[PDB]
Design a protein around this ligand. Structure first.
Ligand SMILES: *[C@H](/C=C/C=C/c1ccc([N+](=O)[O-])cc1)C(=O)O
Ligand SMILES: *[C@H](/C=C/C=C/c1ccc([N+](=O)[O-])cc1)C(=O)O
Ligand SMILES: *[C@H](/C=C/C=C/c1ccc([N+](=O)[O-])cc1)C(=O)O
Ligand SMILES: *[C@H](/C=C/C=C/c1ccc([N+](=O)[O-])cc1)C(=O)O
Ligand SMILES: [K+]
Ligand SMILES: [K+]
Ligand SMILES: [K+]
Ligand SMILES: [K+]
Lengths: 264, 260, 264, 264
């Protein structure tokens, strides 16, 4: 049998995701927000410490992704396109600023599988963001000063996040938006009786992104709210204040992943 | 009892679609195709006749739409964004070349309702098209020569159309009006064959704009499916593939013939 | 061209719904509720009167439907099965008790089309109800005393209703559950400039059901809440108090519809 | 951090699936089928061998599931109800008859996660089956002689299986329907460079079902077809002949899993 993820199969096609490289091109609506430092700290895994300078700061990102591998998979958009909502929280790893990801939602099963392999704790959700069309007109915002963009995320039919940004000026240092590495947790439990508290995989990891590119980056103001929902804990990170709003394209390739600590 | 479409309500908010103006901005992946003239003619309503020059020609379009009205509704993409697959067939209306729309599919209930009001016979479906990102890289095609775009449409979990285009040249000067049929039946016993609304209409588009248009080669197939008839217009050969942005506003509709 | 609803076609197959008869078999989770009489009155169309005895009373129903016509269409569950959430409000039509339906949600486009033809103002939604399995065990409630059933409805990814019932005893008079006729409003607007306020169809109608049958009818206690949501007005009929909860099978055939008053 | 599957969280609620017990109640439309012995053998993992008596035989199952755990989770059908399509293939393990599961599809993210933990190689799909209603009438088949039931499965908008059964008589020995234990493969790859062919988890497992129960079991005739689809390999198991069709309720609890061989 062949394949990278399940299902393994005779021809290695049925698997949810093939082996890397995984290529990504996306458009991001992002919102800087600030929650209670203690609430953010409660989500951190062992190995990460509160950020001494910006504890409580986080970033909420709504992304329209397009994925591809080595065979022009982006020509099959029914499988390759997906929409994603995640938050990261400022933290430190041994004195270095990092971005811990506690929650993330996608509308695609292949994306969910790729995320689990990376340690992104992906669940299914419905994610939407306003789109900018270059033809212009009253059906689209301008990708420039004054342009307004909305974004929402739902899980199991429940709205969990709603955001709006208003662009003001270009980002001076676009590459700096990706300065903090994302930290994740690869986790796969055991089902054998007596071992439900002894996961087979449980390791802190740092996301490794090849050939990262950011373009058409804009910054402005933002409004954001997290909403309580049954079976979710996002709203346990209350939005006390919103920072800047961001809009940019993002691209990278995934071929690697750094294990920081293997907790068995 | 305020509102434009149902549900009517005390505040006029719950309705699937409010009154026009309806604004649209979209990106189109399309394929010119040719089917059997007799098959195309079989779909034509009363009032339309076969095209004496291009009978059998049609256009398949996959569109990523964004809608808005008078209140920045595009800030609510969960309701305002939708994806659409339709075909048009060359025909004549009183000697004038037109484009008849027999089938169209969308993934949004508000778009379905707006379409019914326009005479677009919209059903629900799953529609996807490759997207071009300006950042570039291996996760996206590049708009321009050699850029490849795929598109698909499904209905009730059944794939009904698959397409791919390869762009070759830009179009410097970016023509048939779309003809639709407003149709709303009666349920009163004895009147199931006497629709309350049954009228040929011409789509009216305000402030139409097309940008960044490209043409190239194309592959297209319609697939047989239960409860669908699209594949009864088999693709005997393809013409040009094309890619462009499209914008217009809807405020009006032209009644051509009332068959009720 | 052939067909009943659009699209009309050479074979009359592609249409969203064929001509009647339309057959229905369903399982209902229902909740009697009481809202503000003035709020219920605000939703009533011209021609209906507030109920002089039970103004403000309504019924919320979550239904798992199976539809069929003359050709065993229920063998195609991808098209024929759908789930439905609606409310009715007590009202009077010329001194006779009736049930006005202001809002209804389904997860199926064919059902939406059939609804519009009937005057049910259907929109898309996600509807779910707990199901009872004869095999029993910890994965199912019992269809009998003590059985608990939950139900929810969402629209555009927003939760608009959450309900729970606990069964106590059989319904004393099952047939009486369908005593109030449902009143609807067939409505189809015009798009020609200058006529956006002059609908082509605008007529009050009474639902006509053939061969109505109820079975396995139970009654008990109930909890219900409507939730505010963007683009919805259901929560403007707040649940001030809940009445009885109901669980029953329902079946009927649709071949007819009674026009009460034509207004445009 | 609390939780069984990802996401781990402060309160242990956001996780896709909590720790077992997992309770299941479902209604199965099943079809016995026969494919090419060599095609079935091509899907078998190491440790399984062709069945010396019935190589090529399989069972296609369409199931309407309801899940619960220790807190009446079936009162939240938006999360707890899901629909499932799978096939099993007759095989042998060390001379014992077993049922290997190469492919399986569900319409719920929690179900997909639970399956991965069990070694069920679940992907997202759309699955439907005709339902029998006690009220009867033209909208439902009879759960008895002559009752006809349809079932379908799609993946990424592509139909991959269509089936129909006609019931004839009760199953003589209902408990015998679950005689072959199911064999699965727990599999979780590595993303670290150089280790994309060295999965972290890769083990043959046998499904352990507690308190298995079958009821309302019927048998009859069947028709079945697998359809080719991009990104799938189900149709590489062509249906040369269909055997009997089955309709029954099924219930069990999952608390355990038996590791047969660790191939990591
Ligand atoms: C699943 C998700 C891939 C991860 C996407 C992602 C989001 C945000 C950052 N970031 O650094 O802000 C990085 C990666 C998949 O389908 O791979
Ligand atoms: C429903 C759809 C209305 C607009 C669709 C459309 C498609 C193609 C052309 N065309 O000129 O080729 C024009 C209009 C809605 O949501 O309004
Ligand atoms: C659309 C809806 C059909 C109507 C269902 C219905 C609900 C409730 C009652 N009632 O008397 O309480 C009657 C009928 C369709 O798909 O037809
Ligand atoms: C995922 C799936 C659970 C497994 C279901 C299943 C199907 C068939 C048999 N069988 O023995 O034929 C056993 C179990 C989940 O959501 O757990
Ligand atoms: K604009
Ligand atoms: K490229
Ligand atoms: K029970
Ligand atoms: K029957």
């Amino acid at each position: 049998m062949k394949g990278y993820t399940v299902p393994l199969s005779p021809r290695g096609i049925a698997n949810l995701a093939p082996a890397p490289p995984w290529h990504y091109a996306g458009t991001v609506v992002g919102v800087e927000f600030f929650t209670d430092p203690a609430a953010a700290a409660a989500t951190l895994p062992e190995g990460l410490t509160p950020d001494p300078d910006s504890a409580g700061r986080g970033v909420a990102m709504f992304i329209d992704w397009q994925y591809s591998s080595t065979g022009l998979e982006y020509l099959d958009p029914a499988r390759s396109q997906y929409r994603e909502f995640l938050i990261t929280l400022d933290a430190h790893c041994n004195g270095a600023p990092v971005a811990w990801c506690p929650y993330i939602y996608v509308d695609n099963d292949a994306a969910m599988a790729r995320g689990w392999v990376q340690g992104f704790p992906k669940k299914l959700g419905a994610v939407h963001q306003t789109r900018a069309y270059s033809v212009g007109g009253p059906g689209t915002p301008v990708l420039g000063p004054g342009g307004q963009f909305g974004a929402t995320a739902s899980s199991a039919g429940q709205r969990i996040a709603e955001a709006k940004i208003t662009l003001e000026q270009p980002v001076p240092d676009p590459a700096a938006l990706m300065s903090r590495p994302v930290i994740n947790l690869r986790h796969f439990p055991r089902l054998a009786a007596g071992q439900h508290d002894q996961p087979a995989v449980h390791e802190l990891v740092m996301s490794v992104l090849d050939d990262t590119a950011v373009s058409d980056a804009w910054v402005g103001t933002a409004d954001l709210a997290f909403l309580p929902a049954h079976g979710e804990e996002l709203a346990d990170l209350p939005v006390r204040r919103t920072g800047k709003g961001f809009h940019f394209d993002l691209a990278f390739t995934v071929t690697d992943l750094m294990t920081l600590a293997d907790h068995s």
